[PDB]
């Protein structure tokens, strides 16, 4: 009784800008509509062809599957070809098992994009703070005006000094063992993170009550 | 006693700027202080006889006469404070300087009225709430070419053609073409949203003494 949820949640492409990533086996697109397409590609004599398409909704719950050109395929393009009347469609929890891995190409890619997609940008006296869209436990980058950079993940905290010297902090035991000057930077970043999380929370609540256009992303303040 | 005429100006979050008037030369510094340079014309050149320097909250005023009242000449930055320094609270300020404080006070209001505090992108328009609270101005730049401008007195409308008109009453707005009321309704919808947000962010800013939460840009142009 292994399920698709076991492996992944439904992807979430809201507020993400269009982007197209080409690998050897698959091409993955976030469209202008915020739908996510996986084009599966075969090479026939120095030319890429699209033989299968998965068209996933922006909330990841609906998967439409089709085979361009009645299974013969079309040459690869900038955009994925459109469905005809010949389609199969599934809900997330009804998607057959053979499509699971191909859904993951999309999930994994959407998580990557989110993790580099600014949700809240917050200019301080010393830093530019960015909370990314890949919640929960979203990434947080802090670009100090003097050149220092701190990047928080749910796995580690990377620090890059002005030199370009860099190291990872995998622990909380590690955090405190630093050189005081670096602990100041780290403190400012934690301050910035708290503020961005509070504002995310309150603005999100207002968004939910308000029938209107998105309140994200936001840019708060300006650079000195 | 000066409280009788105007309020202390407020230059928080405003960007630096320098304007020559007929009266003086008014400047918002990088420090967010505000300098009034009063300039006479001896020879045919410009000389600064007096300088008023007001803090960003408008409550502290520093006055100094460069060169004893002889006057250092006009530059692009204002002259450093000399020996002859006076400093006052807003409420302690001698009447001699009131009209000169109003020069600064009105300039800052003008600048505030044109300074975005909240920018918010909707499906149809770019809405901006301005910094001149209370009752800040609110401009709506619809993507199709219409513009609406909500002062606390009046509401200016500008059609795609450029046809402009002003509305000062509930009776005037009601007798508007149907398409224009649609625009007006979007504008008012956006106003409320910006006002609600302003309140919640402002609330949270008080609870978190930190770098300013304004200006803010919300969403993107589609």
UniProtKB/Swiss-Prot annotation, chain B:
Modified positions (Phosphoserine) in chain numbering: 80
GO biological-process terms attached to the record: centriole replication; cilium assembly; de novo centriole assembly involved in multi-ciliated epithelial cell differentiation; positive regulation of centriole replication; protein phosphorylation; trophoblast giant cell differentiation
Localisation per UniProt entry: Cytoplasm, Cytoskeleton, Microtubule organizing center, Centrosome, Centriole; Nucleus, Nucleolus; Cleavage furrow; Cytoplasm, Cytoskeleton, Microtubule organizing center, Centrosome
Protein keywords: Acetylation, ATP-binding, Cytoplasm, Cytoskeleton, Dwarfism, Kinase, Nucleotide-binding, Nucleus, Phosphoprotein, Serine/threonine-protein kinase, Transferase, Ubl conjugation
GO cellular component: a single term: centriole
Protein modification: Acetylation by KAT2A and KAT2B impairs kinase activity by shifting the kinase to an inactive conformation.
GO molecular function: ATP binding; identical protein binding; protein serine kinase activity; protein serine/threonine kinase activity
Phenotype upon changing residue 85 to P: Decreases substantially the interaction with TENT5C. Does not affect localization to the centrosome. Loss of TENT5C recruitment to the centrosome
Highest rank taxon of the organism: Eukaryota
UniProt-reported outcome of changing residue 84 to R: Does not affect the interaction with TENT5C
Domain Cryptic POLO box 1 (CPB1) as annotated: residue spans: 1-114
Domain Cryptic POLO box 2 (CPB2) stretches: 115-222
Subunit text: Homodimer. Interacts with CEP152 (via N-terminus). Interacts with CEP78; this interaction may be important for proper PLK4 localization to the centriole and PLK4-induced overduplication of centrioles. Interacts with CEP131. Interacts simultaneously with TENT5C and CEP192. Interacts with TENT5C; this interaction leads to the TENT5C recruitment in the centrosome. Interacts with CEP85; this interaction may be important in cell migration and centriole assembly.
Disease field: Microcephaly and chorioretinopathy, autosomal recessive, 2: A severe disorder characterized by microcephaly, delayed psychomotor development, growth retardation with dwarfism, and ocular abnormalities.
Recorded family membership: Belongs to the protein kinase superfamily. Ser/Thr protein kinase family. CDC5/Polo subfamily.
Purpose: Serine/threonine-protein kinase that plays a central role in centriole duplication. Able to trigger procentriole formation on the surface of the parental centriole cylinder, leading to the recruitment of centriole biogenesis proteins such as SASS6, CPAP, CCP110, CEP135 and gamma-tubulin. When overexpressed, it is able to induce centrosome amplification through the simultaneous generation of multiple procentrioles adjoining each parental centriole during S phase. Phosphorylates 'Ser-151' of FBXW5 during the G1/S transition, leading to inhibit FBXW5 ability to ubiquitinate SASS6.
Entry note about domains: Cryptic POLO box 1 (CPB1) and Cryptic POLO box 2 (CPB2) domains can simultaneously bind to both TENT5C and CEP192.
Protein name: Serine/threonine-protein kinase PLK4
Organism (species): Homo sapiens (Human)
């Amino acid at each position: 009784n292994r399920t698709l949820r076991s492996i992944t949640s439904p992807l979430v492409a809201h507020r993400l800008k269009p982007i197209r990533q080409k690998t050897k086996k698959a091409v993955v697109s976030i469209l202008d509509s915020e739908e996510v397409c996986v084009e599966l590609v075969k090479e026939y004599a120095s030319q890429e062809y699209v033989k299968e398409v998965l068209q996933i909704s922006s909330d990841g719950n609906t998967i439409t599957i089709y085979y361009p050109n009645g299974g013969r395929g079309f040459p690869l393009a900038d955009r994925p070809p459109s469905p005809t009347d010949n389609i199969s469609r599934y809900s997330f929890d009804n998607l057959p098992e053979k499509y699971w891995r191909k859904y993951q190409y999309a999930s994994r890619f959407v998580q990557l994009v989110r993790s580099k997609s600014p949700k809240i940008t917050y200019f301080t006296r010393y830093a530019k703070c960015i909370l990314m869209e890949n919640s929960p436990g979203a990434d947080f980058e802090v670009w100090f005006y003097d050149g220092v950079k701190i990047h928080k993940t749910e796995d580690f905290i990377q620090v890059i000094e002005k030199t370009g010297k860099s190291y990872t902090l995998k622990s909380e035991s590690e955090v405190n063992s630093l050189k005081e000057e670096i602990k100041m930077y780290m403190d400012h970043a934690n301050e910035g993170h708290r503020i961005c999380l509070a504002l995310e929370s309150i603005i999100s609540e207002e968004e939910r009550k308000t029938r209107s256009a998105p309140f994200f992303p936001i840019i708060i303040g300006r650079k000195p």
